Each structure stands twice: as C-alpha cells, then as structure tokens.
Nucleic acid binder design. Structure first.
Ligand code: AGS
Ligand code: AGS
Ligand code: AGS
Ligand code: ADP
Ligand code: ADP
Ligand code: ADP
Ligand code: MG
Ligand code: MG
Ligand code: MG
Ligand code: MG
Lengths: 314, 301, 313, 296, 299, 298
DNA sequence: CTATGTGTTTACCAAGCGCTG
DNA sequence: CAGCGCTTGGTAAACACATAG
C-alpha cells in the first residue's frame, strides 16, 4: 500500500496544537472574507509534518494545489507562474531554499504585487511588459530558512515553526498507522513505541514498521506491550530510544576518559569512528536528551548519563 | 484586493524626513529650471520604501514612469532605451544590481552622454537595490543622487498602521496602533503584516473596534514580546542564559542545542537580537548581555 | 573478487544478519519491496557484496550506479524512470558524493515515489510529476555525516558494518584458497587473518602474496612457517604493524620515555607533518591498544612495551 | 573640454615630462612612441589622450576592449594616417585572441594593408591584468595621481562658468576640500550645492552658503558621509576598535557585506582610518582622533 | 639506454627480490600480473622498471600520462590493449575525478561503458608519496612497492654503463665521484656525466681522469656533498647570522630578495636528508655537519 | 643593433664560459645541443642570448611564446624546423595543461602524435623556477641562470645604443645612467632614450655628466634608482600606518593599486635595496626609508 | 571556452584552561 | 608558577558548480 499515509483534514492532523490554534484563525478569517490566504512559510527539523500541512491547508481552503520543488527549478519560474496559475490557487514549493538567488528575484514582483516584469520581443522590437497574474497563494517548506534571501523572507505573510511531538501524540500516530495498514496493536505497545521515538513522526512510523516486521516473522497476531518491548530490545533501543552506538559512546566517555572534557577527535579515535559521523549523527540527540554537553574544553557526560548507564555519579 | 497600499504623493509618504528635505530641494530645483532630474539611486534594508519612493518621485515630477527590473533584462536595454523612453520621463530599474556586467556597460555611456549613434532624449534613471556592491564602479559613479533609506520610529509606524486601517475599513485606536508600531522591527512591511494578523484575530473574535486591550490580546496570541520578539527568538536567549551560562558558545554548538540550522540561526534570528543589544558576537562566541538577562526576568550575572 | 551470493555464504556479520533475516523474510512474506536501506562503515568490509547478497535473497534485479557518476539530475531522473522496475534495487555506492541538488531530488522519490522535473525550455516551460515504480534504494557510504539529514531520515533500515575477527578472516582466507585450488592450512589462515587490520580485502591481498611466495618455492601446502616468513618479507609485525608504526612507537618509548610528548614535538621528532601522524598512523595504534591519548600528551601503553620487547615501565 | 596642455588643470608632474616628450617628437619629425597611462578611475585619462592628440597635431581614434576579435585588423588598416594616435581604454580587458594580434603591429609594424607607423595610448586602472609582453611593448609608462583642493576648485569654477552659476573662490575651495581627490565627485557636489543655493534664492554661492549646503549633505572636512562616520562609530564604540570581521560588521550596520567591502571601505582605507587584518577590521588612531574620541 | 632485464637494472635489489617472486609466479600461472603501484622520488627509474617488467612478461606496453586523459581512456583501453598488457600511467595522482571513477570497473570487473568487455590487463601507476592518492585508489593495487635512493656505487655503475654505451673512457674513481655528487638519483648522475664529458672534450684528452672530473664538477659549482651554491648561501646566512637558532620568516628573504618560494620546496629537503638541517620545535638548527662542512674550525 | 657572437654580448660572465664549453663540444661531435632552460628576471636579454646561440650554432631560429599554444605544436615543429634548429619559447611556465603533455614526446624520442620529427634544440625561458613543473624541469639537459649587470656593462650598452642612434653620450654620464638602472638592460635603454629627448629639447649635442644628472632628476629618479611610484609607496606606508606592519590587502587599497603588480614589479626592488621587509604580520619600512625620505626615526 | 556570482570547505591564528617538574 | 599541550571559535580565502554569453 502506501507507507507515507498523509492526513487529509486539519482534524486528522495530530499534535501541532499551538500552530493549529493560529492556523484555524487565519483560515477562518480568509474564508470569511472570500479572499485567498497570505503567503505561508513552514520550517523546522525533518519529519514533523510540513509537507502534510501544506496539503491539509490546501484541502481546508478548498482550492487546487500545484506542487513544485526548489531543486526542480531563473527564466523558467516566470513561465510556470504565468501559465500554470489560476485565481485563488495555492502554489507549493518544497525545498524552497534551493531556489537560486537569481530565481528568487523574479518572485519579488509577484508575491507583493501580482505582476511580473517580462521583456518580450526580438532585436530592436524588444519591449517590457508587466504581465498581470491572478491572485494566488505561495506555500514554502524548508529546513534552512537562512538560505532564502531577505527580501523574499520579508514577503511571507505567515511564518510558522514545526515543533517536536510528545510520546502520546506519537502513540496516536502509531495507532492511526496501524489501523490504516491493518495491524492490531495495543495502546500500551503504541506508547512504548512512542517513548522511543525521538519526537519525530517519521521515526515513530519506521519503528512501528520494524516492530510489525518482527511480530509478523515471529508469527504473532496482536502486538502486545511485552511483545513490542521484546521487538524493541531486539532492535537494540533503550527506554530513551537510545541505540547501542550511543550507549557505547557514553560508556567510553564515562569509563575510558572519566567523563571529563575530551574533544571530538580523541573520542572518535577511541570509538573507532569518523569524528564527523559521530558529531553529525549521534551527538545531536545525546545533547537534546541532556546526556551530553559541549563545554569550551570538550565533551562532558552529565549526571543523567551516569544515572542512565547505571554508574555511580562522581 | 490590494494590500500594498502605496501612497502617490510625497505628502502621503510617512517618515523619511531627513531624506525628504533633500528630495524636496532637488525636485523644486529641477522643476524651477525646467530640466530633468539627475540620475537617482536608492538603497537600504528591505521593507523601507524604495519602490514607493520611486513612484512618489515619478508622480511629483509630473512625468511618466517606465518600470522594469534587473533580472528581467545586453541587446534588450538598448532597445528599451532607444524606443520606449520619451523626453523627460523616468526609467525605473528595480533590483538594478542584477543587471548584466555587459548590459551595465551599455547603460552608463548613455547616462553620461545621451547618445546610444542614436540621439537619446533627456531621461532620468532611478535604481533601487539592497546590494549596491554588485553595481560596477563606472555605473555607480554616474548617479547624481545616492540616498539611503532608514528605519522608522514607532510613531511613524503607528501612522502607517492607522492609514492602512482607514484604507481597508478597519476601526482601530491610536493607542492600539502604538503597540503594533513598538512590536514592528523598524519596518513598514512588518507593521502592515502585524496589523493584518491582529485584524484577522479581531475579526474571528467578532470585535468591531480594535482597542488597545484587544490589540494586546491579539499580539500575545501571535507570541510577541514588548520588543517584538517571537517565541523562537526568546528560546535562543533562554538556551544561552540557562544551558550555557550566558558565556561564549559559538554558532555550531548553539545551533545544535536549538535543533536549528546554523545559517538560519545566524541570518534570520540573530541580526535583530544584535540590533536591540540583547546579543553580542565575541570572538570567543555568542554572549548574552545584561539587557537579555533583565528582559527575561533573570537576576543579573 | 569472489563474491558470495547467499546470506549463509556471507562470512562474519552475525548481529547484522540477525536483523536482516527477519526484514527480508517479512518483506518476502507480504510480497512487497524492501525498505530503503543504508550501509555504512570503514572500507573493505563487504558493503557492495552485502547489497548483491540482499538482491539475490530478495530475488530481484540490481542496477548499480555511483555517487560521482550522477553528474546531473537528468541522469538520476532517467535511471529512476526508465531503467527501474517494480521491486527492483538501485545501489548507489559512495552516496555521500552526490551533489546537494541531486540529493534533494531524491526526497520525493524515496518518500512519495514521484519526481519533480521542468520541461518546456523557455516560454513553454512547465512542471510535471513523474510517477515512479515502487523500488528499493540501497546506499553505501563511509561518511554518513556528509549525508543531508532529510535524506538520512528517509532510510527505513540503517545498518553498520563492523570489523572482522581474526577467525572470520581465516574463514574467508580458507574459502578463497578452496575456490582458487590452493591448499592453505588452518594456522597459516589464522596468521594471515591476524596480520590483517580487521579487513577482508587486506586478508585476501595478503593471502594472494603468500600464495605467490609459496608457489615460486615449489611448495604445495602453505604451512604456517612459510606464511610467517612471507609475511615477514612483506614487512608486518605480529599485529600487522608496518615499519613506520614500529619506529613511531620506538621514538615515543626510547626518546621521550613513553610519557606525554605532544603532537607537535612527536611529529617534529619523526619529521612528519601533524596531518599524517594523526590520521594515518595514530588510529590503528589506538585501536590495538598500543597508543593512548591523554590531556598531557600521547602515552605509550604497556602493551606497546611488551610488543617491542622492551623492559616493562 | 580642454584643447591644449595649458587648459589641462592639475597633472603638473606628468605634464612637465609630457611637454618634453612631445617637443622632442615634434623636433625629430617622428611620431611619439607608445604610451601607457595608469591611475584610479575618474581622473581624466581620456581627456588627457584628447589633449595629447591635439597637441601633437594628428587625429585620435577612441576604442575600448569590450567594444564588440578581427575588428582590430579593420581598425588598424582602415582609419590610420601617418603619425595617427589610437587610444584603447581599458587595455587589460582586451581579449587574448586580440591580445596576440597587436604587438606585431607595435614594434615590427607588420601584422589587408601595411601599416606605415602609428602610436598607441593605452589607459587602464588595473596594472596586474596586463601581461608582461604588453607592458614591455610600451615605450613610455606614466601614472595619473589624485588632484588637490585647489585644482578641484579650478574645475568647479570652470563648471560654474559653463553653467552660468556664480561662485566665490572660497566656496569652490571648500567644495574641493570635501571631494575625494576626484573631478567627478567635485562636479557632483557643486551641482548639489547649486541646487541648494538656487532653491534658497541667492545669486552668488558664497563660502558660508557652500558650507551650509555641505552640512545639509552631511559631509566632514574629509568628505566622509554619514554612513562612513556610522561605520567608524560602530567599529569603535560597539566592538572596542578591535578586529571584527566583514559579516559581523555588516550585520551590525544592517548593510550588505559586499556593499560595505566595495563602496565604503576603500575610502576609509587610503585615509588611515581603517585596516584589513586577517582577524578582522581594526580602527586606527586616526579614526579615534577624527571622531573626537579619547585615545585607545 | 633503457635496459630490458631485471639483471640489467642497477640497484633496486630489495624491491627486485619480491618483484622476481611475483613476476615468476604470474608467469608460471600464465595469467596477467596483478595491478602494481610504484612509489618513490622522481628520477629513480619507474618508467625503466615498467619497461623491464613488460619485457620480462613478454607482453607489450602502453605508457600513458596522468593528465593526458575522459573519452580517450576507454579508447586506449579497448583498442591498443590485447591480453594482459602493462598500461603505465605516470603521475596517477593527477587524474581528474572523471576518468578516475571509470578506472574501477575496468580495474576490477574488466568491463567499461553500451558496455564493452575489456580484456585482462595490468595497470602500473606511479606517484611520489602514498598520501597523494585517495584511499579508494589505494585499494585495487595488489602490489605496492617503494623505490629507494641509489648508493654512490650504483650511480657509478650507471655512469660507467652510459660512458661505455656512448664511447667515452672513464676511470672508476671519476665515476664514483660523479655518483657521490649526485643526490642518489640516476637522471642527475647521467646529467652530471654528460656535463663532465662536455667539459673534458674541449680539453682534447681521451680519458676522463678523476682530477679533471673534480675540476669539471667544481666548474658547475658543486661541493663534495653535491650542494648547490644557493644551499651553501642559505647555510652561511644561517650560521654566520643566527648561530643555529630559528631564522624567522621576516629575515628569510632579507638576504635573498626573493619570494618565500623555492626555499620551502627545493632547499630544505636535501639539507635535512644530508643531516645539515634539523627541524627543532623551537626552530631550524644547523647540526655539527653544517659547521664542519663550511670550512669552519671545530667548536 | 643586436649582438651576434658571444664576444659581442655585453656582460653575463660566468655563463658565457659554460656556454662556450657546451657549444664548442656540440660543434666538435656534430649533433644538436641539449635542451636549455634560461632563468632570470625580465629584461636581462634572454631572447638575445637565444639569438646568439642560434647564430653561433650556424642554424635557424623559431622564436615563439608560451601563451600562444593543440596541434599548433605539430605545425610549428613540422615545417618551420630544420635539423638542429632552436625553438626558443618565452614564458614556458604559462603553457596549457593540454599542449604541455605533448612537449615531452617531442623532447625524449623526437616523435609527436604521428609523423616523426628531426632533432631540435628546444630552449625555454621563465622568470621563477617555482612556476615550472618538476616533470618539465627534468626534461632540460642544461639549466642556467642569468644575473644582473654591473653599472659598467649597462654603461657600455648605452654607449652602443648611442653609436647606433647618433648621440654622443659621454662615458661618465652613461655610467650614471647605468647606476640609476636597476641592473636591467631594458631599463637602461629606456632611460637613455628619455635622456636623449631631454637633451634634444634642451638644445645640446654632447651630453655631459651634469646634463644627464639634471635630466634624470627632472625625470623623477633619485640616486638609488627609485621612481616616484616607489617613493610614494614608502611615503604612504610611513605616514598612514606609522611604518607598522601592513599586509598586501590594505597597502594595495591605500595606494589605489592591486595585489598584483604590487609585490611583483614594485616592492621586490624595495626589499632588494633594504627598503622594505616582509614581516609575518605585515610590511615594515626597515628604518632606511626614514633616512632616505628625510623623516625622523620612530 | 569565459566570466561572475554562490554555496561549501578549510587553513592559519588567537584565546582560555589545566598541569608539570 | 610561565612553557607546554589541547580544545574551540571565527575569519578570510580558496574550490567547485551552475547559468548566460
Ligand atoms: N501531524 C501528523 N499527523 C499524522 N501523520 C503525520 C504528521 N506529521 C507527519 N506525519 C507523517 O510523517 C511522515 C513524514 O512527514 P513529512 O510531512 O514528510 O515530514 P517533512 O516535514 O516533510 O520532512 P522533510 O524531509 O523536511 S520535507 C509522513 O508519512 C506523514 O504522513
Ligand atoms: N512611507 C511609507 N508610507 C506608506 N507605506 C510605505 C512607506 N514606506 C514603505 N511603505 C510600504 O512598505 C511596503 C514595502 O515597501 P516597498 O515600497 O515595496 O519598498 P521595499 O520593500 O523597500 O522593496 P524591497 O522588495 O523590500 S528591497 C509597501 O506595502 C509600501 O506601501
Ligand atoms: N584634469 C582635467 N582638467 C579639465 N577637465 C577635466 C579634467 N579631468 C576631467 N575633465 C573633464 O571631465 C570630462 C571627462 O570626464 P573624465 O573625468 O575624463 O571621465 P573618465 O576619465 O573616463 O573617468 P571615468 O572612469 O570614466 S569616471 C570632460 O568634460 C573634461 O573636460
Ligand atoms: N563476508 C564476505 N565473504 C566473502 N567475501 C567478502 C566478504 N566481505 C567482503 N568480501 C570481499 O572483500 C572485498 C570487499 O570489497 P567490496 O565488498 O566490493 O566493497 P567494500 O570494500 O566497499 O566493502 C570484495 O571483493 C569481496 O569479495
Ligand atoms: N637502474 C637504471 N638503469 C639504467 N637507467 C636508469 C635506471 N634507473 C633510471 N634510469 C634512467 O632514468 C630515466 C627515466 O627514469 P625516471 O625519471 O625515474 O622515470 P620517470 O621519468 O617516469 O619518473 C631513463 O631514461 C633511464 O635511462
Ligand atoms: N648583453 C646585451 N648586449 C646587447 N644588447 C642586449 C643585451 N641584452 C639585451 N639586449 C637588448 O635587449 C633586447 C631584448 O630585451 P628583452 O626581450 O626585453 O629581454 P628578455 O628577452 O630578457 O625579456 C634586444 O633587442 C637586445 O638588443
Ligand atoms: Mg526540505
Ligand atoms: Mg534587492
Ligand atoms: Mg573602468
Ligand atoms: Mg562503498
């Protein structure tokens, strides 16, 4: 079937309560005035639901949605904007940061004023025209808003940030995915899967799929809490969703170096790992959970790491 | 229908007083001797009123305005100059820094001497850009007037908010507009956007007059401080003060601790904190000042 | 070299094979394509071989490409649209060398199985969505930190290839000898595995060189002594230490007393730039427990004393 | 529009040698050898070429590098007389295919038509972009230097006479003091002061009116605008005058880093007010003294 | 002048011991030799070694350059290469990242891209240091070997062979001196022999005697250690101006009036090899050999 | 005009002896000379040396330039080369990364791809040995370096120029012209033809020493040969930076110059004459500029 | 083939802590 | 207590890559 089952309605959207509270007001005001929405920008870490929110907003407004990509697209964008746009329709550009700095400058006369500067003609007959565009809506989703030019960031009426989820919302997502796929999972098992998900919906769905694989191979029919725990232990995840490599890093830091300041290169060599791989894959979540610190003298293991690994704090 | 409610007169232009005095002197002098105005260049941070000022100047001079763009244009600019330009009219090129380095070489010889050999008429060029550094020095040296747009005081932003409310049909109070002006970041576009969001909140709530209290409620719902700081901007200072002691941190460590891209944390969030004096860029890293400490209700270091 | 085609023929990744077996069995049971899979680890461990073995176990075709081989997004679009089939596998070796624009075309392809391209070349330009078949993407890389995070989050299965023990390298050497007709013994295979640095490719190369040395001498069986003398001729310690590592340890022990020396002082005593001692020689000395990094400096471990035949500290 | 070497305003040191060279060329009845002129933009190199052309007594053919690779042959074989002068502005931008087509016609006189003899005057602002053969094929190399307040005052007086405006010598001198050693800047400032005085309604631009108009423009005695003073103030007061860096300084000034590097910085340098350290930008003691701040 | 047998090769005895083993085993198995990589300083005989290897196997040779190659590597691989033939690529580290990735399919699976079935062949690369090539490249070479600096006796033997092949009479001591002045390099020794022959020919003599060889070598400005006059000047401005302490970057060009160029790449390596310079962490220090060699009284 | 034999060549001793030996031996055994590489600062007369070598060898010349070269190497080595012909190349260090690799096969075994080539003596010329790759440097059998000229050699060169022109410069004045020359023959010739114009306009036929000194002073040259540009550089440094260390980013900007010719054509002479120092943190006036420019020491 | 403009990576270079005898 | 490491941050300068020409 489909492994990227996206909600169609803002009610099926799960856990962006603070964002949804303002989004409902904006959508209601726009629909009451019989006017298209303001240009909208969504940003945040991967896997939180920007691409799903774009489609949910398009369905809520009732308008047609045209989907484009940043890397897909300077002179082309003029043709797409002139030919493929209708009145009140939404144009969605994923990875809008990938637009070249030259291609974004064509959107300046098109987002605030609904016109476009086009030079039409050959040789001495060349002239300039202002091609009027229908009033539309632009939605952009990106992880790097700082790669967008300032005059373009200034033209977005609404800018919103996608925040992390809670274990209960991740459990709700797991339950919805199980119901749509056809797998019977208990609420406690879904909560256990959610607690090991790193506040991300894609991670929760992937973990549920792996647990389903384990249960199906084992011949089970209902993914009970204890069966889910056994499958997660087979996957090698702690109660914080901490893999074996992260636990190895913490153990090496606590034991071999005494938990004190070390540095990236020394710890990487002690772990037989590439320093960049470590600092870009394993370190960020250890920092987020409070199990690691980047002091000016080097990496330090906190008391949370000592209490989680079962060692006596110093 | 229209949200960029551009004024058409220099009297309706709000608050560029220091620039407006010189502009009035230049325009009156040019009109008195029946000669076209000198070539003019406007630059400054986004949202300050360069295009609006260009249109206002065109209206004040009483001549026609031909609007084009830098990205929209070497063999074209010659045709536009030789065919579409009347005598005494204005050619406005927006984002003029994007002009080709060959199309720029075909422009300044026609700007100094009005010959292309086609005898061009007397015309004035207006250029508006955010990056005058991309303009070649030969082209940059032919501009008779070069001006810089400055930020707006909260009272001028309040005047702009009241004008937008009057034109749209919304009823707002002067004290209500003062809060929106204070929370605006010295920019007119930001003030208009904040007024529109407060208007949406008030219309949904059913209120007919946006008093000061209702405006404050809407602004709190938007998540804005008295300094115009969003939640994402307050999180930076909170993480800096609490998780790092306020001392030097660095871009990479701060970005990792905030689950943020370093580039956006450096170019979208930090400039306004630095402008307000709530952040410092020490060579050892980023440091939270005493203003950031007492703004968030923390005891001084 | 001689690549196995069965997961039982694959030699020495047991914790990885335990996870992979249930994934493959469940994917085949549902008659569905496998998830996008990423293999990362140090070179020479068998990532390409594992990709081929996975393709054989699933029973589908395998289209092999490379990171630098895809210069433009048009190549990736053509491969994904024309060269692929439902359930097939596209293996991209060195996937961290893809350009960022080429990595960002893979997001819809891996998640939604669609693709965004622009066609028209001027005033007739337009955007279309190419609908892709349900395929499987396998990526092999040695630098997972060079992969963009949205791309790294789109992999259903992420696995790590670990170093082989001397016994598994001996098993690989014996398999290679049996396939090549040579009659090596258990002890010689164990010695060749110990001389290796936990890598299968190094073990195979050392076996080939020892085979040449034994063949020119007229011997029909590669006895342990012949392997020992051939490996001594190749210039390896009992731990596979080259002469440069030996003399680095000797300079650390004799000249500085084995105590903290520092990177700059040790490098200038060895006439080496501090970008070759740290990245080419230090990691293996630390791996074997012969070198120790301390805030004061670099310290030679007692194991380095016992290995070099020096009096204990 | 000067015609002779006496009408030229303020290149005295160069003019003394140029007069001798032209006199010798006339006495020998032989055309002058090739001449290369260096100098910052805005100093009047093309005007000097015209003056030389008139003084020698021959015609001038003004050309540039990016003016179109085979057109050089048509130029050199279609519009040259005996002893003619051919002027190429921006000679370092000449294409390579054209670059190895001119020096055969410089020394050997052979590249159509056989060129009898002529002289080439080349003007450029970037000597580093001229290859060694091109620099070695020029007989005379000369440098254009910046003007002085008195020479710029003379230029301002000439412009006022051309435009029908009346100025005193003191006002013209004050305008020329604030010019950045350039004639173009002096003319622009004179036009702005003319606008101010005409709007005021004064028949003669006295020194006091010129000073008032230049204060209304926001100019120091050094010619620094408000933005340059703001850059110095931000550098000194907010960063202690120490190294900062282009990005941090641009963020503090709310300015494009490229604009700050290319428009404002070059005049803060060349005046002793700024340095470009590998660790950032440092304000010198001259910046402290100019702004009325205590020494570091 | 190029030899054609490993016996005729002069002085790579340690490398030749293993090369004979690998070569004989490959010949006995009647299969192409594995890919080979040659390290070492320039001028030691890598191309001559490739020619000797090709003649020993009996197969032909297809010498190629590094920066010579994208669309021509496949052409030379398919057309000129029969069953296993040495394709020598000098300066393999200079390949662009366009044909480097096309080598691995041909090196391992012996097919390149339509897809063409390339025949079996052996590739011989050559660089100066292991670090000049990327790690993926230093993985498909079965044999990795290093060339060593020649001793004065081997250089003298090469000079004598060149003299015999040319028709010039030289005493053993003169050739030994010429080899001693050479920096352990065959091309340098051959060049010095040619210069000495040029100097001794105008004198009209028939035998290149040791004294004439020393006079000719002194004419070009070479001491007993083969140092150029620039190296002697550097040593002089080191000792007689600093006493053996750090030289300092500011004062390096004061006595040279030159950019910080060749001093960082042409002078220091040979001085360190000869032991005249030591890179003490405080700074560059001249050893006792520098003091004694420059005609100074012992300390 | 241009010297033909080595005796007519002015100065450049310690290089005309080795060259004499090599050319005599090459004549004796009758085969083309080995490939030669010439080093030295520009203006020392490398092309003249190539012409003298070709004339003494009794063969032709094929002077070309580096950045003029692709199959044009085959064209110029095919029809324009007789056996044992010199093919002097100027600025050989600026060869393209494509045609350079075709020079080696023409240099070892005299075959270029496909027709074979005769034996030819290629002569190169470049400023710095660091600009030419080691594989190319290894291809030249003979490598020599040109040195500067003493004031007497420049004086006699100026005398030869006067003889070819018709001027009667005295020995004591040509000596001063050579002294103010920066050890370069081209600079000496340029100064002589400037003094010629100055004396012609002054109304004189024989140029004594005092007249030459006055003409050189009016041209803008001091006793050390410094022009107005170098003195201006020193003045700007000393005044606007107190003689302190300044890198080649602020000094070039303050002089309205570029980081190009500056430190390439202007400053090397300043360091050579002990007027500038390349400090790790910048550039210093070395306290001799203060004495030369009449300023109090720091 | 060339040229600019942009995004990404990297090599000094300086500062701040902790130890040793 | 004042050299000797180690660790980190930022700043300028290269590289590589794309579009128009
Ligand atoms: N609030 C939500 N409710 C239900 N499913 C969700 C929600 N948010 C995300 N998902 C699902 O999580 C998966 C990933 O969501 P995406 O919207 O693709 O994340 P993303 O923000 O687009 O990540 P990128 O790589 O930055 S585009 C999809 O299968 C979605 O259906
Ligand atoms: N003085 C003013 N009075 C009223 N509205 C103004 C004024 N200045 C600016 N605005 C408004 O500010 C908004 C944006 O400013 P613009 O006039 O478009 O110039 P600009 O924003 O500086 O150009 P860019 O794209 O940001 S570089 C428009 O909606 C204008 O109406
Ligand atoms: N020294 C001068 N004396 C008299 N008139 C001058 C002088 N310099 C310039 N002019 C006048 O300036 C005009 C010529 O402009 P220039 O300054 O020569 O422009 P330019 O030399 O090409 O410099 P750029 O790089 O184009 S700004 C003519 O009207 C000249 O009369
Ligand atoms: N488990 C294994 N069993 C047998 N041979 C192996 C095994 N792992 C690796 N090899 C051999 O080692 C070599 C490793 O190279 P390869 O797997 O192609 O790529 P990588 O070196 O990136 O893993 C292969 O030639 C393969 O034949
Ligand atoms: N052992 C040797 N015996 C004879 N000649 C040698 C020897 N080693 C090197 N040479 C000479 O060196 C020349 C090329 O060697 P070298 O410069 O090392 O190769 P490359 O130029 O490929 O680096 C050959 O002409 C050869 O005559
Ligand atoms: N020693 C010399 N004797 C006579 N003339 C010389 C001498 N050296 C140089 N010249 C003159 O200089 C000219 C060559 O100068 P140039 O080409 O600038 O030097 P280079 O070839 O080193 O760049 C010749 O015309 C020649 O007349
Ligand atoms: Mg994205
Ligand atoms: Mg702009
Ligand atoms: Mg110019
Ligand atoms: Mg791989």
């Amino acid at each position: 079937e489909d492994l990227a089952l996206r909600p169609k309605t803002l009610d099926e959207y799960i856990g962006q309560e603070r964002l949804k509270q303002k989004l409902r007001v904006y959508l209601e005001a726009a629909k009451a005035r019989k006017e298209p929405l303001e240009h909208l920008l969504l940003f945040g870490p991967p896997g939180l639901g920007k691409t799903t929110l774009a489609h949910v907003i398009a369905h809520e407004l009732g308008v047609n949605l045209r989907v484009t990509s940043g890397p897909a697209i300077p002179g082309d964008l003029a043709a797409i904007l002139a030919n493929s746009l209708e009145e009140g329709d939404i144009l969605f550009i994923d990875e809008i940061h990938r637009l070249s700095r030259q291609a974004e400058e064509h959107l300046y006369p098109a987002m605030e004023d609904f016109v476009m500067d086009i030079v039409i003609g050959q040789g001495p007959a060349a002239r300039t025209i202002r091609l009027e565009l229908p009033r539309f809506t632009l939605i952009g989703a990106t992880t790097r808003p700082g790669l967008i030019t300032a005059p373009l960031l200034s033209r977005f009426g609404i800018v919103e940030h996608l925040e992390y989820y809670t274990p209960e919302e991740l459990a709700q997502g797991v339950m919805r995915d199980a119901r749509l796929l056809g797998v019977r999972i208990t609420e406690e098992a879904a909560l256990e899967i959610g607690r090991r998900s790193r506040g991300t919906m894609r991670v929760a769905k992937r973990l549920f799929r792996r647990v389903r694989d384990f249960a199906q191979v084992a011949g089970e029919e209902v993914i009970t809490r204890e069966r889910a725990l056994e499958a997660l232990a087979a996957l090698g995840l702690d109660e914080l969703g901490l893999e074996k490599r992260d636990r190895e890093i913490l153990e090496v830091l606590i034991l071999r170096f005494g938990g004190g300041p070390v540095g990236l290169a020394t710890l990487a060599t002690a772990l037989s790992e590439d320093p960049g791989t470590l600092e870009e894959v394993h370190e960020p979540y250890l920092i987020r959970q409070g199990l690691l610190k980047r002091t000016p003298r080097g990496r330090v293991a906190t008391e949370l790491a000592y209490r989680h690994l079962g060692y006596p704090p110093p």
